[PDB]
Design a protein around this ligand. Structure first.
Ligand code: HEM
Length: 291
């Protein structure tokens, strides 16, 4: 399988910046969502879920085809709750119907991060919508009641090493779990929607307690009212993971750089970029545009 990146016919940077601006502006305006968390987190999660279905073995899945748009994918239990981000993007797509889905879902995650004050993530256009049959089967996304071994092994399928895994996980500082979606609940609330290295600090700083929740699942709850998934917690049980966690807890800049690189990578997995392809774009935030 070869997925070659094909620039939307006749569009340039400026055309892309506009879609970005539209998402951003809508993010600003719809701030009531999930009790004032906003849609940032869910968009980030959505961009990670359309991309984490990738299989470096056979090159199937990944962000390329925008297959989330189909029933199979769309109704994937691990995707429970992502429909809200989809609905959020829907009108934007309507406004800019020439953008591919894969491009849209992915751009939302980028805009979200940048608008939530995270680092700039270079982004590449060119994803192409594939047919319904290219939709990966369910079961490709990671479970949360596991440990480091599982995690390590899991991410390998996506070509991510240890530093990449830890950098990517710091996105867990955003939003929250919802009992109805995944069977986990918390923070005890409420929540975060600024991008920072907070995830690491919490993990190292709190006094976590293992407890079962209303869905009959275990989770690590802290006195401060926070929570961590077992898989989250696992980054401190593993010696290799732990030193990286510590590193990020100490240097937000380090964390931002690595996150940036890993995120782009995650979103570009499985795609082939012709030589003639335009470089990746770095979009300006609203604020940088004075909007
Ligand atoms: C071991 C790997 C992972 C597991 C098992 C995990 C699983 C989870 C779970 C169970 C949810 C909460 C869903 C809900 O109830 O709405 C969550 C939330 C979230 N995921 Fe992850 N995830 C992992 C990795 C990722 C990564 C790498 C990213 C992106 C960089 C990420 C981004 C987020 C965001 C931002 C939220 C909060 C969403 C919201 O507030 O609705 N997660 N993840």
């Amino acid at each position: 399988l070869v997925h070659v990146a094909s620039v939307e016919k006749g569009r340039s940077y400026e055309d892309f910046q506009k879609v970005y601006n539209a998402i951003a502006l809508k993010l600003r305006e719809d701030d009531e969502y999930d009790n004032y968390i906003g849609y940032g987190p869910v968009l980030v999660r959505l961009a990670w879920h359309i991309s984490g279905t990738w299989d470096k073995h056979d090159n199937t899945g990944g962000s390329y085809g925008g297959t989330y748009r189909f029933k199979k994918e769309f109704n994937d239990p691990s995707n429970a709750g992502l429909q809200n981000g989809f609905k959020f993007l829907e009108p934007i797509h309507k406004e800019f119907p020439w953008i591919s889905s894969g491009d849209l879902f992915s751009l939302g995650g980028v805009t979200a991060v940048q608008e939530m004050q995270g680092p700039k993530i270079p982004w590449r256009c060119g994803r192409v919508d594939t047919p319904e049959d290219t939709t990966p089967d369910n079961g490709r996304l990671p479970d949360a009641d596991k440990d480091a071994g599982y995690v390590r092994t899991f991410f390998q399928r996506l070509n991510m090493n240890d530093r990449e895994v830890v950098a990517l996980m710091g996105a867990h500082a955003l939003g929250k779990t919802h009992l109805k979606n995944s069977g986990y609940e918390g923070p005890q609330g409420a929540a975060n929607n600024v991008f920072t290295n907070e995830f690491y600090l919490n993990l190292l700083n709190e006094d976590w307690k293992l407890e079962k929740n209303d869905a009959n699942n275990e989770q690590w709850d802290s006195k401060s009212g926070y929570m961590m998934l077992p898989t989250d917690y696992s980054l401190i049980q593993d010696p290799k993971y732990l030193s990286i966690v510590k590193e990020y807890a100490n240097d937000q800049d380090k964390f931002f750089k690595d996150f940036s690189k890993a995120f782009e990578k995650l979103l570009e997995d499985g795609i082939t970029f012709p030589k003639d392809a335009p470089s990746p774009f770095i979009f300006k935030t609203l604020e940088e545009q004075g909007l």
